[PDB]
Design a protein around this motif. Structure first.
Motif, PDB file in Angstrom:
ATOM      1  N   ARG A  40     -11.735  -9.924  -9.337  1.00 51.79           N
ATOM      2  CA  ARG A  40     -13.121  -9.192  -9.464  1.00 51.79           C
ATOM      3  C   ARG A  40     -13.820  -9.040 -10.603  1.00 51.79           C
ATOM      4  O   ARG A  40     -15.016  -9.218 -10.435  1.00 51.79           O
ATOM      5  N   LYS A  41     -13.148  -8.960 -11.792  1.00 51.10           N
ATOM      6  CA  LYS A  41     -13.837  -8.860 -13.134  1.00 51.10           C
ATOM      7  C   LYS A  41     -14.538 -10.333 -13.375  1.00 51.10           C
ATOM      8  O   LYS A  41     -15.389 -10.568 -14.009  1.00 51.10           O
ATOM      9  N   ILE A  42     -14.067 -11.359 -12.850  1.00 59.61           N
ATOM     10  CA  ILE A  42     -14.770 -12.572 -12.879  1.00 59.61           C
ATOM     11  C   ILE A  42     -15.362 -13.144 -11.490  1.00 59.61           C
ATOM     12  O   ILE A  42     -15.435 -14.497 -11.189  1.00 59.61           O
ATOM     13  N   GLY A  43     -15.853 -12.188 -10.704  1.00 62.75           N
ATOM     14  CA  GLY A  43     -16.938 -12.657  -9.922  1.00 62.75           C
ATOM     15  C   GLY A  43     -16.579 -12.380  -8.507  1.00 62.75           C
ATOM     16  O   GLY A  43     -17.081 -12.663  -7.275  1.00 62.75           O
ATOM     17  N   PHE A  44     -15.095 -12.105  -8.138  1.00 64.18           N
ATOM     18  CA  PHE A  44     -14.727 -12.127  -6.817  1.00 64.18           C
ATOM     19  C   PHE A  44     -14.886 -10.872  -5.837  1.00 64.18           C
ATOM     20  O   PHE A  44     -14.539  -9.757  -6.387  1.00 64.18           O
ATOM     21  N   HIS A  45     -15.882 -11.093  -4.826  1.00 70.09           N
ATOM     22  CA  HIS A  45     -16.244  -9.747  -4.027  1.00 70.09           C
ATOM     23  C   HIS A  45     -16.351 -10.156  -2.743  1.00 70.09           C
ATOM     24  O   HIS A  45     -16.744 -11.421  -2.189  1.00 70.09           O
ATOM     25  N   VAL A  46     -15.538  -9.444  -1.948  1.00 74.18           N
ATOM     26  CA  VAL A  46     -15.373  -9.501  -0.386  1.00 74.18           C
ATOM     27  C   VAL A  46     -15.509  -8.001   0.295  1.00 74.18           C
ATOM     28  O   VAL A  46     -14.722  -7.253  -0.240  1.00 74.18           O
ATOM     29  N   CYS A  47     -16.400  -7.805   1.018  1.00 74.12           N
ATOM     30  CA  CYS A  47     -16.579  -6.490   1.639  1.00 74.12           C
ATOM     31  C   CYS A  47     -15.661  -6.446   2.887  1.00 74.12           C
ATOM     32  O   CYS A  47     -16.280  -6.434   4.266  1.00 74.12           O
ATOM     33  N   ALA A  48     -14.512  -6.598   2.778  1.00 73.19           N
ATOM     34  CA  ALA A  48     -13.628  -6.397   3.856  1.00 73.19           C
ATOM     35  C   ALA A  48     -11.991  -6.027   3.317  1.00 73.19           C
ATOM     36  O   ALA A  48     -11.533  -6.604   2.374  1.00 73.19           O
ATOM     37  N   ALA A  49     -11.547  -4.798   3.815  1.00 77.24           N
ATOM     38  CA  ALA A  49     -10.406  -4.209   3.574  1.00 77.24           C
ATOM     39  C   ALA A  49      -9.320  -5.305   3.905  1.00 77.24           C
ATOM     40  O   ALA A  49      -9.194  -5.750   4.972  1.00 77.24           O
ATOM     41  N   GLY A  50      -8.171  -5.282   2.948  1.00 71.89           N
ATOM     42  CA  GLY A  50      -7.081  -6.164   3.061  1.00 71.89           C
ATOM     43  C   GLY A  50      -5.945  -5.736   2.716  1.00 71.89           C
ATOM     44  O   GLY A  50      -5.939  -4.899   1.357  1.00 71.89           O
ATOM     45  N   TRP A  51      -4.648  -5.854   3.147  1.00 71.63           N
ATOM     46  CA  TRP A  51      -3.281  -5.681   2.431  1.00 71.63           C
ATOM     47  C   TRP A  51      -3.320  -6.496   1.166  1.00 71.63           C
ATOM     48  O   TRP A  51      -3.786  -7.503   1.018  1.00 71.63           O
ATOM     49  N   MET A  52      -2.620  -5.750   0.352  1.00 69.90           N
ATOM     50  CA  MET A  52      -2.084  -6.322  -0.796  1.00 69.90           C
ATOM     51  C   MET A  52      -0.828  -6.064  -1.332  1.00 69.90           C
ATOM     52  O   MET A  52      -0.067  -5.134  -0.324  1.00 69.90           O
ATOM     53  N   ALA A  53      -0.194  -6.341  -2.349  1.00 71.02           N
ATOM     54  CA  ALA A  53       1.297  -6.139  -2.777  1.00 71.02           C
ATOM     55  C   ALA A  53       1.482  -4.569  -2.674  1.00 71.02           C
ATOM     56  O   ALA A  53       0.575  -3.769  -2.992  1.00 71.02           O
ATOM     57  N   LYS A  54       2.829  -4.299  -2.318  1.00 71.76           N
ATOM     58  CA  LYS A  54       3.195  -2.947  -2.332  1.00 71.76           C
ATOM     59  C   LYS A  54       2.858  -1.998  -0.983  1.00 71.76           C
ATOM     60  O   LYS A  54       2.927  -0.948  -0.889  1.00 71.76           O
ATOM     61  N   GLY A  55       1.969  -2.860  -0.106  1.00 71.09           N
ATOM     62  CA  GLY A  55       1.358  -2.245   0.896  1.00 71.09           C
ATOM     63  C   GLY A  55      -0.048  -1.493   0.705  1.00 71.09           C
ATOM     64  O   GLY A  55      -0.367  -0.548   1.428  1.00 71.09           O
ATOM     65  N   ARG A  56      -0.623  -1.582  -0.248  1.00 66.77           N
ATOM     66  CA  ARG A  56      -1.890  -0.976  -0.717  1.00 66.77           C
ATOM     67  C   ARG A  56      -2.897  -1.664   0.140  1.00 66.77           C
ATOM     68  O   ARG A  56      -2.905  -2.898   0.473  1.00 66.77           O
ATOM     69  N   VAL A  57      -3.975  -1.111   0.750  1.00 65.86           N
ATOM     70  CA  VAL A  57      -5.231  -1.714   1.145  1.00 65.86           C
ATOM     71  C   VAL A  57      -6.448  -1.519   0.407  1.00 65.86           C
ATOM     72  O   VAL A  57      -6.566  -0.466  -0.243  1.00 65.86           O
ATOM     73  N   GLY A  58      -7.060  -2.327   0.144  1.00 67.90           N
ATOM     74  CA  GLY A  58      -8.488  -2.220  -0.583  1.00 67.90           C
ATOM     75  C   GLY A  58      -9.300  -3.525  -0.429  1.00 67.90           C
ATOM     76  O   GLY A  58      -9.193  -4.303   0.301  1.00 67.90           O
ATOM     77  N   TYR A  59     -10.322  -3.398  -1.353  1.00 70.01           N
ATOM     78  CA  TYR A  59     -11.429  -4.690  -1.217  1.00 70.01           C
ATOM     79  C   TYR A  59     -12.136  -4.508  -2.548  1.00 70.01           C
ATOM     80  O   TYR A  59     -12.405  -3.531  -3.132  1.00 70.01           O
ATOM     81  N   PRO A  60     -12.561  -5.794  -3.031  1.00 69.54           N
ATOM     82  CA  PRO A  60     -13.156  -5.698  -4.300  1.00 69.54           C
ATOM     83  C   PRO A  60     -14.821  -5.876  -4.151  1.00 69.54           C
ATOM     84  O   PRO A  60     -15.360  -6.724  -3.703  1.00 69.54           O
ATOM     85  N   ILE A  61     -15.283  -5.014  -4.987  1.00 69.30           N
ATOM     86  CA  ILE A  61     -16.685  -5.000  -5.053  1.00 69.30           C
ATOM     87  C   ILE A  61     -17.292  -5.184  -6.644  1.00 69.30           C
ATOM     88  O   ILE A  61     -16.944  -4.773  -7.432  1.00 69.30           O
ATOM     89  N   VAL A  62     -18.216  -6.461  -6.576  1.00 73.92           N
ATOM     90  CA  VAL A  62     -18.835  -6.752  -7.973  1.00 73.92           C
ATOM     91  C   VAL A  62     -20.076  -6.128  -8.141  1.00 73.92           C
ATOM     92  O   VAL A  62     -20.406  -5.659  -9.197  1.00 73.92           O
ATOM     93  N   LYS A  63     -20.709  -5.849  -6.926  1.00 68.83           N
ATOM     94  CA  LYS A  63     -22.276  -5.556  -7.077  1.00 68.83           C
ATOM     95  C   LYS A  63     -22.480  -4.525  -5.773  1.00 68.83           C
ATOM     96  O   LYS A  63     -22.443  -5.052  -4.730  1.00 68.83           O
ATOM     97  N   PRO A  64     -22.867  -3.325  -6.212  1.00 66.79           N
ATOM     98  CA  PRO A  64     -23.055  -2.261  -5.146  1.00 66.79           C
ATOM     99  C   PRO A  64     -23.954  -2.612  -4.188  1.00 66.79           C
ATOM    100  O   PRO A  64     -25.038  -3.209  -4.503  1.00 66.79           O
TER     101      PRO A  64
END
Length: 88
Positions: A40-64
């Motif tokens: 995300r710090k280098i521009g990765f932006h997706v408006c879609a919640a997803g599974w990640m390690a450890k069973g966290r869910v979230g999604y990266p925002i670069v610009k609101p």
């Protein structure tokens, strides 16, 4: 690096185990939170919640609301979301 994946059947259709299997199938693993954050710090932006390690869910925002929107480590691993994969 890090990337977003949906089930073949469309948006928010992967359980945690399925998400993990999809990232593995493609040669990687679920991204960690720190990996997703670095992406995300280098521009990765997706408006879609997803599974990640450890069973966290979230999604990266670069610009609101900038940052990873954290839906937390989910009690119910049969919830259906997308997946954030890491394959370097």
């Amino acid at each position: 690096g890090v990337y977003h994946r949906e089930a073949r059947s469309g948006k928010y259709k992967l359980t945690y185990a399925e998400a993990k299997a999809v990232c593995e199938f493609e040669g990687g693993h679920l991204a960690t939170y720190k990996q997703l954050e670095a992406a995300r710090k280098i521009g990765f932006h997706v408006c879609a919640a997803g599974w990640m390690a450890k069973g966290r869910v979230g999604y990266p925002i670069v610009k609101p609301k900038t940052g990873i929107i954290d839906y937390g480590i989910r009690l119910n691993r049969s919830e259906r979301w997308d997946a954030y994969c890491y394959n370097p």
